């Protein structure tokens, strides 16, 4: 009962690796970005989260979508946790580089992208290259989009970045332990973590673990040959990406309503994570069984919008799907469009 999905999945494949002069334009965006940001007072340290990294896609069915992480490394951080979130906090610290934008004691988040929204924008006419226009946009974190030419997009995002030990609600996150060992707990927890503003009171981060993901999803396995040959060959990433492509196809046809909208892909990486935790054997996700796997994935989604809880992979109680930050009609919404699609096959996918 593979089929369908497999030809889905080869589809995407070759939109990825088709030759593309995209990739090309943006390193030279952001090149020019970086050296200009470094020879400035606040932004000196600044630099990109991975480097090779100038073609990281949020929209797995956008090709001409990138989304880049400039990090920024702040010594000696003093977090307060805001209101008792557990996932938002306000950022302390004494000449730091950062200091021009303090408010008493706390770092300023819309100062600080005014600043490097100024900077770039600055320095985007001064791109004598090729077509580059930015755009004030009030999503703010994804805080400057560039547009390059036509098709291409770039999010830009800013964080900050800290190598002391993780703020502790996460002690109780990333429960990889029975399937990803709990040494590997360890040596993750041991990576450094990064704060990226809210888009509430004004001036709160939260943290960022896309670099944590990336850590898991390149190496995702109980057994450490997973995927290096097709003898234990599985079908994890492939669920993830008909998890993404699902949401996406869907934010897409009910765009014109407005129901959608609070939903990411964000979303979908947090359950499937709670569904490889819930199944860590490699044998519970042979590509054989590419679509009753997948079928877990979509059953647990569900659930979880049925019952109002997805909690946060790394800090356990930050419910995603608490009604004060998705309402119950539009979790009632997505769970009967996805019922929908899947008691029909998932008709979404057989479309372009
Ligand atoms: C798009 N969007 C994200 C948040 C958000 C809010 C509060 C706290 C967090 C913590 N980050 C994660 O859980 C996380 C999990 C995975 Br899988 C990969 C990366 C991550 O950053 C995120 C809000 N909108
Ligand atoms: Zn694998």
Redo the contacts with the bound molecule.
Sequence with gaps: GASKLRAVLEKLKLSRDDISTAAGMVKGVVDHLLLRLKCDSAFRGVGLLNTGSYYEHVKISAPNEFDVMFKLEVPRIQLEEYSNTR??YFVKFKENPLSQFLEGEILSASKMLSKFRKIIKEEINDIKDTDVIMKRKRGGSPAVTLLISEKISVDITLALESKSSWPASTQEGLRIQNWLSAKVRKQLRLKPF?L?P??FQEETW?????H??KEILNNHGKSKTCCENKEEKCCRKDCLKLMKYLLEQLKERFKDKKHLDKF????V??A??HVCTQNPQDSQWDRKDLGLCFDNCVTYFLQCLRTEKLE????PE?N?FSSNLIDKRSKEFLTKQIEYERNNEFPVFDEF
């Design positions: 996932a938002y990064y990226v809210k888009h939260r943290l960022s673990f896309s944590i993901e990411s892909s964000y979303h990486k947090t499937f994570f946060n992979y790394f800090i930050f995603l």
